[PDB]
Design a protein around this ligand. Sequence first.
Ligand SMILES: CC(C)CN(C[C@@H](O)[C@H](Cc1ccccc1)NC(=O)O[C@H]1CO[C@H]2OCC[C@H]21)S(=O)(=O)c1ccc(N)cc1
Lengths: 99, 99
Amino acid sequence: PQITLWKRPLVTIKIGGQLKEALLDTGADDTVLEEMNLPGRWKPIIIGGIGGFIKVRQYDQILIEICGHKAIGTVLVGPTPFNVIGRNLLTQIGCTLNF
Amino acid sequence: PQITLWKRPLVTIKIGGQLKEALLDTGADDTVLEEMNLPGRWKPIIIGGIGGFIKVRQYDQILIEICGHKAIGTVLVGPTPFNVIGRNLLTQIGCTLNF
Ligand SMILES: CC(C)CN(C[C@@H](O)[C@H](Cc1ccccc1)NC(=O)O[C@H]1CO[C@H]2OCC[C@H]21)S(=O)(=O)c1ccc(N)cc1
C-alpha cells in the first residue's frame, strides 16, 4: 500500500500473538514497543531521542507482521510513548519514501 | 525521488538562506530544527519525544526548500539532537510511504 502523511502512519502489527498498532517511523533507526513479553535472551540497552533517553530491553530476531508483511529483526521493549516501527524492520518489508 | 531506508533518509534543506541536512521523519508530526535565527515572530512551546520533552520556539509559515521541493509551514527551533522534517511539511511536498 501507498500511505499519505496527512494522518499519523499507523498500521496494525502482530507480534508474539498480540495485536498492536505502531508508527511507520522513518526517523527511527530501531523498533521500540510498549511493555510486553517476548521470547529468548534480551540485554538491557538505552536509546534516546528528543527529550532524553529511556531504558529498554533488546530482543533480537523477533518475528513481526507489519500490515500483513513479515519481518524478523531486533525489537526494543520499554516505556516508549508510542510504538514505532524503525528502519531496521521497515527495510525488511521494502518500504520507501517517495515524492 | 524514491528513498530506501537502509540508511537514514537525510536530505538537504534550504531555510532562511542557510543550508542544512534533515531527516525525513514520518514519525514526527511537526518539523524541529537545531538552533538558528528565523526572521519573524514566534511563541514558546514544548514538544515531547521518546525520553522527555524540550522547549522550542514555534515559527509559523516558514519557507523551506526540501531536496528541491518548496513548502511553507510551522518550524520548531530548539535543542533537538537532529533536524527532522515532520509530517506538517512532508505532506506539502507530496511524500508517501510505499511497500
Ligand atoms: C516520539 C516519536 C513518536 C516521534 N519523534 C520522531 C522520531 O522519528 C525520532 C526522531 C529522532 C531521530 C534522532 C534523534 C532524535 C529524534 N526518533 C526516535 O525517537 O527514535 C529512537 C528509536 O530509534 C532510535 O533511532 C534514533 C533515535 C531513537 S520525536 O523526536 O519525539 C518528535 C515529536 C514531535 C515533533 N513535532 C517532531 C519530532
